[PDB]
Design a binder for this molecule. Structure first.
Ligand SMILES: Cc1ncc(COP(=O)(O)O)c(C[NH2+]CCCC[C@H](N)C(=O)O)c1O
Ligand SMILES: Cc1ncc(COP(=O)(O)O)c(C[NH2+]CCCC[C@H](N)C(=O)O)c1O
Lengths: 435, 435
């Protein structure tokens, strides 16, 4: 079966709503996807929805003959890492701890899938709250609710469908828990310190009210440090620092969902490191290839927590061993080539270019924003946003929509300034056409 | 980091409650796991909890130099198959359809993880019921409950934690929906046709009562065709045929969870093919490597179902491309070497040997049972069962517990009769020690 027949074959069995190209697995490389049908090269600011750190076929992986042998050994089989340990697995875990570890969060747990990473973070919190309640003479039936934000996206699974609230298409007609949801006080243009502080104060009031009206029943607060799917909405560190204090006052865990922000994109291992707020638990995925949680801080105060008691958390495989081997090589490249720092520098460059765009097109390029390489801007209407994405597609630049009017950039950490310039050049060409 | 240091390294970050061995990825093969620490070979009747169809490093995979190149191409990267299609993906899908497909169930959907496969089956049913309700003048807020069995295991995720009911450790302190649960009328020794029929009639009465007391609100009935984790509990085809009629009478979908039974273990592609009951949806995983659902039958009667409307179901990756490439090669081996038929024949052999054991040890080897290679027996007490597993471990045979008193066999489809004899020889040696 042939590149020009891929869509026909898949269309017999599935809804085929993805891209019109067929990925060439061999010829794609770095910031470029190759369409196997035409041979056209596409500039990639999409990176499999922000899940590729180094882009396609990175040289450090492709040229490493020893790694080839390690990867092949892992790829031929699929052990249940839950039950059966290997050297390949242990090397991944120690390098994950070294490169991305936080000394306050020593407990690691791996699983396949971002939604399930978040769910295990939730399960840790539910167990923790119930046991903390029990230890202090409170009914252990209490501790089952999750405080969360409007505009959140945490996944499409049983628990995360009660949290995710972006597009109705995602959650409509699926049963949900009635969990408390508060306004998201994200930064918007033309609001100064005082106006921001007032916005935050109102979310915080809603948060406090939830805690007081559902006593001992809220196990945790979950947030994305920067909301991705909801529209690259950024929050001041002050908001989360206040939430941190409020969580502690009501004995609730703070969980950061770093599935989209994590693994270097904002310029640090984790976005929370720049906000200077310490979470009790972090859910990770996408760029990490294997998904999972890191936990500690207050979690350890309950001695029989989910990380200390056998069989409270599990899955058949405990993550994909092939993903672990690939991820450990990727982490070694990040560490050796200083890619977090490269993301800070190139992220400053991308951001500066978006600021220039805003100046040249004041009524059209709205709210340029970003942290590291996680950058975005918005258009006046969703029709404009949609049209700009199509115009870029015609020019062989792949970017992603978010929310109602946002265009987001998700370049690989290895993107060059010339590649950023090419993406920006395409946007400048397309904009007069959309206006 | 060295085989003898694997447990120490992992133990700094995780609960290390798995096996005392370290898997040698290279030297393991067929029905044998190799401990990298000692070089001792272990007879494998566990197969990464029934997730390996051909065992370790099968020759058809290891010796195939063209497949090596295809696997390597897939393993180096991890595309989002949700968005970006490839030839590798299309070849997997057409071979899955050819080898395991059912002409009544043409809609395929893939995802990482068995619990999420079941959840997507549930989501399809919730959407279907709500839309079917709406189309017939019934409130579309109705259709949110799942009828299911006692002793069921469907996963450890948000929706499946409301269904799974085996050991309290799995579900305790996690929030749940109040979904209707009925007795499981499984076959037990010393019950004849009439007594079985009475048992079934009572479950069916409970099922009917649930439907009548929760009108238009039960979207589906979910079952394992043979309950695995709950204790290899088998059901007569009559029970499911009656459930099939009852589902149709109340406009509810029937879903079979074949994550553990599927992909040839019982001697057919799917266990439901031997029960002669047509499901509307099948959840699969484990041996398939990639997980997912097949759907059709009544699903198609709602034209805007979840398989026809973009973005109702999704994940970042849409399954792991490396798993798809491996699975397609495994399916080709199954088809070429007649491994379903080999499972029927060797399954009859294993079963006959367990019958012999029951005769030689009448008060100790209870209820020998099986379908194909999915076989089991029970012991008088859980202390006896636990001790037998330890005694087998000392003799380098790996088997799994289930329920309170069951020992289950999960050999690879490629197991030989000499390997079955070796496992049986070990059980005969260990039994006098446990008594
Ligand atoms: C912030 C955040 N949390 C969890 C997830 C879920 O990850 P996974 O898809 O289950 O592996 C995500 C995923 N976000 C977007 C990429 C996939 C496409 C799209 N979100 C979808 O509609 O499913 C996340 O960003
Ligand atoms: C019948 C059945 N349905 C769903 C699942 C869930 O699959 P996954 O683990 O999410 O990939 C299973 C899995 N059953 C057992 C193997 C793993 C160990 C154990 N069940 C556990 O405690 O998690 C299944 O059998």
């Amino acid at each position: 079966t042939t590149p020009d027949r891929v869509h026909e074959v898949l269309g017999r069995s599935m809804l085929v709503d993805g891209l019109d190209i067929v990925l060439d697995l061999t010829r794609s490389g770095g910031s470029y996807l190759v369409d196997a049908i035409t041979g056209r090269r596409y500039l990639d600011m999409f990176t499999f929805v922000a899940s590729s750190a180094l882009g396609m076929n990175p040289p450090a992986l492709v040229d490493d003959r020893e790694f080839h042998a390690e990867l092949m050994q892992a790829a031929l089989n699929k052990p249940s890492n839950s039950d059966v340990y290997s050297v390949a697995m242990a090397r991944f875990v120690e390098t994950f701890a070294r490169v991305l570890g936080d000394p306050a969060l020593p407990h690691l747990f791996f699983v396949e899938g971002g939604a399930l990473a978040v769910e295990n973070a939730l399960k840790a919190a539910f167990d923790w709250k119930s046991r903390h309640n029990q230890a202090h003479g409170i009914d252990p039936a209490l501790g089952t609710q999750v405080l969360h934000l409007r505009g959140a996206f945490h996944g499409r699974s049983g628990y995360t469908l009660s949290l995710t609230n972006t597009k109705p298409t995602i959650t409509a007609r699926f049963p949900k828990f009635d969990w408390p949801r508060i306004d998201a006080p994200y930064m918007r243009p033309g609001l100064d310190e005082p106006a921001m502080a007032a916005l935050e104060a109102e979310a915080l009031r809603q948060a406090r009210a939830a805690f007081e009206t559902r006593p001992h029943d809220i196990a945790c607060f979950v947030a994305e440090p920067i909301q991705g799917e909801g529209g690259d909405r950024h929050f001041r560190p002050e908001f989360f620092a206040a939430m941190r204090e409020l969580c502690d006052e009501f004995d609730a865990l703070l969980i950061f969902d770093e599935v989209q922000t994590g693994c270097g994109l904002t310029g640090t291992a984790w976005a929370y490191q720049q906000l200077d707020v310490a979470p009790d638990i972090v859910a990770f995925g996408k760029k990490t290839q294997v998904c999972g949680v890191m936990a500690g801080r207050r979690v350890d105060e309950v001695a029989d927590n989910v990380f200390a008691v056998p069989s409270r958390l599990n899955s058949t495989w405990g993550g994909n061993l092939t993903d672990m081997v690939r991820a450990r090589r990727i982490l070694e490249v990040i560490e050796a080539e200083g890619l977090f720092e490269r993301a800070v520098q190139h992220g400053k460059y991308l951001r500066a270019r978006l600021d220039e765009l805003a100046a040249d097109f004041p009524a059209v390029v709205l709210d340029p924003r970003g942290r590291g390489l996680m950058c975005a801007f918005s258009l006046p209407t969703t029709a404009d946003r949609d049209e700009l994405i199509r115009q870029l597609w015609q020019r062989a630049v792949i970017v992603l929509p978010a929310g109602a009017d946002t265009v987001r950039f998700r370049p690989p950490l290895t993107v060059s300034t010339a590649e950023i310039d090419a993406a920006i050049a395409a946007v400048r060409s397309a904009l007069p056409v959309v206006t």
